[PDB]
């Protein structure tokens, strides 16, 4: 269907087809050489150059080589520099360039390629949508938002733009504003809208405004395979891990870790209090829009399986204690952190990103009344010197209505059914 051959390339189609047939048969090394010779003999051929780039792309896949792929990314760019490139080929080549740049984490490079695409094809709405994704991936929600505003001003019912616009509104705490965009966008069924992130945030925005339809959207998201269940809505999962809101120490197998936390709880408490008193700036306010109201701050010792050396200067005995337990200090999908919460706090129902961790809470200073935590359909309270364990990939919710502060110590561990192989290979979160 796409017209890839300019006038000259039609005259060498027999040679171009022969080289591409080698690639399609999986003879990647031969195909590379065939297209390289065509590039040698016909240096201005866009199809020979795209053939070279595609073969390098395949070769990078075969060798699992970032460097080979960087070569392909450059050759895709070379295509665009040649004279007389057909429009369909120019778009295919630069789009693949951007896609592979994103794969490598070259987000600024992808952004430049996407900006070029939009300049070359100013009426192509899909390319503007791709540009918005480029901004989202580099953390530039303001420019992403302007992009989807421009798309929606020309094509108001573009469902891809609606769900991404809604995602951005939601992330900016424009909850009510986000719901119709997320909802209409999912309902469009446009390509790219059947995505767990949009079900997740539509249901959550509805929950925050008291719309009871939320769980109908969680049910649909479960039925379409985005969530393990209506209750457990994490999006970075290893399928099949035992799924249970509340866990006993014995069920986790981390009984030595729990015994150490409980036997030594006062030293952990005392270093947390010393930081509250003498280094309170180490407690950073929660920053993921998870509070309806109130004051909640966290002092993080480990994140993504990496020790914060400076934080551990503030709690050196606690960091020494925990170094003996790599099931938490090496949990690259978890943290180790103090968590202080003050009266008048309500934490919105929410879920963590991954079913690959369980979350331990050690009580340090627990007022006798007013503090509780719900996970799924079950609500509990903390006790000083005692560990609670839940799976925070289940929806959970917290209230602090005491008359003084409440301090806990949060210790994430790898899910106990994950093998050492899985724990070494999962991307950090």
């Amino acid at each position: 269907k796409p017209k890839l051959l300019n006038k000259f390339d039609k005259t060498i189609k027999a040679e171009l087809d022969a080289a591409e047939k080698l690639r399609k048969r999986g003879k990647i090394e031969e195909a590379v050489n065939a297209f390289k010779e065509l590039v040698r003999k016909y240096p201005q051929s866009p199809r020979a150059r795209y053939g070279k780039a595609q073969c390098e792309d395949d070769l990078a896949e075969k060798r699992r080589s970032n460097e080979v792929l960087r070569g392909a990314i450059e050759t895709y760019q070379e295509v665009a520099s040649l004279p007389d490139v057909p429009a369909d080929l120019l778009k295919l080549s630069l789009k693949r360039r951007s896609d592979r740049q994103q794969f490598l984490g070259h987000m600024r490079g992808s952004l430049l390629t996407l900006q070029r695409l939009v300049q070359l094809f100013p009426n192509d709405t899909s390319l503007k949508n791709d540009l918005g994704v480029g901004y989202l991936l580099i953390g530039d929600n303001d420019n992403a938002k302007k992009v989807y505003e421009e798309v929606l001003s020309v094509t108001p019912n573009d469902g891809f733009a609606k769900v991404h616009y809604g995602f951005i509104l939601k992330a900016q705490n424009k909850i009510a504003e986000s719901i119709p965009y997320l909802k209409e966008g999912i309902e469009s069924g446009d390509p790219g809208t059947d995505d767990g992130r949009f079900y997740f945030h539509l249901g959550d925005a509805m929950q925050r405004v008291g719309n009871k339809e939320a769980y109908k959207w969680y049910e649909l998201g479960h039925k379409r395979g985005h969530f393990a269940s209506v209750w457990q809505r994490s999006l970075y999962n290893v399928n099949g891990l035992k799924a249970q809101p509340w866990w006993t120490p014995k069920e986790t197998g981390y009984t030595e870790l729990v015994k150490s936390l409980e036997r030594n709880w006062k030293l952990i408490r005392d270093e947390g209090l010393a930081v509250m008193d003498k280094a309170k700036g180490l407690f950073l306010p929660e920053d993921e829009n998870l509070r309806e109201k109130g004051d909640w701050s966290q002092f993080t010792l480990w994140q993504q399986g990496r020790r914060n050396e400076n934080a551990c200067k503030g709690a050196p005995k606690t960091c020494t204690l925990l170094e003996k337990f790599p099931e938490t200090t090496g949990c690259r999908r978890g943290q180790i952190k103090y968590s202080i919460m003050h009266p008048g706090t309500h934490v919105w129902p929410h879920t963590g990103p991954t079913n690959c961790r369980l979350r331990m809470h050690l009580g340090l200073v627990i007022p006798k009344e007013g503090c509780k935590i719900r996970c799924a359909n079950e609500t509990k309270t903390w006790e000083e010197g005692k560990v609670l364990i839940f799976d925070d990939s289940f929806e959970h919710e917290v209230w602090q209505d005491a008359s003084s502060f409440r301090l806990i110590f949060i210790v994430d561990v790898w899910h106990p059914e994950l093998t050492p192989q899985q724990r070494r290979s999962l991307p950090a979160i």
């Binding site: 994103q102 987000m107 994704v133 995602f167 809505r233 970075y236 929410h350 990103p353 925070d392 950090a428």
Partner: peptide, 18 residues
């Protein structure tokens, strides 16, 4: 931004190729 407690970022993992 990192997805520490929630799922608020567009992507929670880093891209580093193969």
């Amino acid at each position: 931004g990192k997805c520490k407690d929630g799922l608020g970022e567009y992507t929670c993992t880093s891209l580093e190729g193969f």
